[PDB]
């Protein structure tokens, strides 16, 4: 660093010596003299994740491959930005990276492409779709604040009748999907590509990959209606029978 050596040779700097960078500040005109003298909401605003964008996160180790993909974890890693003021209502995927993302992992995304669904399943990944209420999703993205507010964990909402067919559809692999068709559906997709179907049971970590929360359950770890002792780093569970009726309701 020859620049540093020049500083030693140069005289000690003072407050007055400081000077603004060249061209940083423009000149101004003032009237001192003659110079200035004389004279749509209903449609969900899906926020997608590109397959190429998905690929680098796994390759860079930003998201642990062993841990199932969680949208909250992506927010924790600053992978995606969700603004409640924007009233983002959904999540999607982008066709970009279809040719550059060869990997298998369990994941849940609100909306997924049918071609993408089978391709990751062909690789061995597990993909499903869940419905998060836009207000609930904002709560999900920021779980700590409502604990600060003191609010208790509410039951996850269900899709409106317009979106019920999508989630209930077996091919869409939604949480409302019929399990009976899943073994047949998995078989059908394998034939379409022709790849040899790997049964989810064969995987050693099958239970971890296939683990899913209840439709009313917002969080994998936390059941609906739960409370968290944030100050004491503990979880509080309601013990009132009437409260169970509220959760059932």
């Amino acid at each position: 660093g020859t620049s540093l050596d020049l500083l030693r040779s140069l005289p000690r700097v003072s407050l007055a010596n400081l000077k603004p960078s060249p061209n940083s500040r423009k000149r101004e005109r003032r009237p001192r003299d003659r110079r200035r003298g004389r004279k749509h909401s209903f449609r969900h605003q899906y926020q997608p994740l590109s397959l190429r964008r998905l690929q680098y996160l796994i390759d860079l180790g930003r998201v642990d491959p062993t841990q199932p993909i969680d949208l909250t974890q992506l927010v924790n890693g600053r992978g995606v930005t969700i603004q409640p003021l924007k009233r983002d209502y959904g999540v999607q995927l982008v066709e970009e990276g279809a040719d550059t993302f060869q990997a298998k992992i369990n994941i849940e995304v609100q909306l997924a492409s049918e071609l993408a669904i089978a391709a990751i399943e062909k690789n061995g990944g597990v993909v499903t779709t869940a419905f998060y209420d836009p207000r609930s999703l904002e709560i999900l993205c920021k779980p700590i604040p409502f604990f600060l507010r003191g609010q208790p964990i509410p039951k996850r909402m269900l899709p409106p009748e317009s979106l019920v067919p999508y989630y209930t559809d077996a091919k869409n692999r939604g949480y409302l999907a019929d399990p009976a068709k899943f073994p047949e559906a998995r078989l059908e997709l394998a034939m379409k590509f022709g790849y040899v179907l790997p049964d989810i049971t064969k995987d050693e970590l099958f239970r971890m990959l296939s683990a899913r929360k209840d439709p009313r359950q917002i969080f994998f770890g936390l059941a609906p209606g739960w409370v968290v002792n944030m100050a004491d780093k503990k979880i509080l569970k309601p013990t009132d029978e009437n409260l169970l009726k509220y959760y059932s309701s």
Partner: protein
């Protein structure tokens, strides 16, 4: 027995560590007692004085409030006169302010105006001793003393610095560019350097915040 310090964070392989003489204020002749390593990313940043110049302007101007007011022709029982209290407050990004602090640290070290010390503890509380010691080590007329935290700063140093106008005692959190420039030489305790390095080095992977870090 030399006092040997190494940077806690990983120094870049391609960048050699920055080094300076460790000093102690216990005795007049205790100019050099150890050798310490300083992070190049902190103590070997480019000397960008416009950032320092901008920070100094920000420091002078974000606190600027003018209370001048005058009555215009309509308010007479001035065509363009001062109109009530006016403020000039503005905020620099934390990245720039941290960078400006980083730039200032290098300049003082390269100009031999920065003196790294193990601790501020002094044998006596007399202000005369501190002034004489500064003359003994040929320090500048103004010497700035920085400690890790305000609460634990030694009593003896407080008395010496409190009575001296040109020698000002500040905590680590109180460091600012204006004080460094106003003071000819800077005296920093070793713990303070680590404290400053941690915050300055924290800028790494500066996640854009959606909420306060706390």
């Amino acid at each position: 027995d030399p006092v040997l310090r190494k940077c806690e964070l990983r120094i870049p392989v391609h960048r050699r560590p920055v080094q300076a003489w460790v000093e102690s204020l216990r005795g007049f002749e205790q100019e050099r007692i150890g050798l310490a390593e300083l992070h190049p990313d902190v103590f070997a940043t480019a000397p960008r004085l416009d950032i320092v110049h901008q920070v100094a302007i920000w420091q002078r101007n974000f606190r600027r409030i003018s209370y001048a007011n005058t009555k215009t022709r309509a308010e007479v029982s001035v065509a363009h006169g001062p109109r009530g209290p006016t403020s000039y407050y503005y905020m620099l990004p934390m990245k720039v302010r941290a960078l400006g602090l980083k730039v200032a640290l290098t300049v003082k070290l390269m100009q031999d105006d920065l003196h790294i010390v193990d601790s501020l503890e002094l044998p006596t509380a007399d202000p005369q001793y501190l002034t004489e010691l500064a003359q003994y080590r040929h320090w500048g007329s103004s010497v700035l003393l920085v400690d890790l935290t305000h609460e634990e700063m030694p009593k003896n140093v407080v008395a010496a610095t409190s009575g001296l106008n040109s020698f000002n005692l500040i905590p680590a959190v109180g460091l600012n560019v204006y004080s460094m420039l106003k003071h000819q030489t800077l005296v920093l305790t070793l713990p303070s350097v680590a404290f400053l390095e941690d915050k300055l080095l924290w800028q790494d992977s500066r996640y854009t915040p959606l909420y306060p870090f706390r």
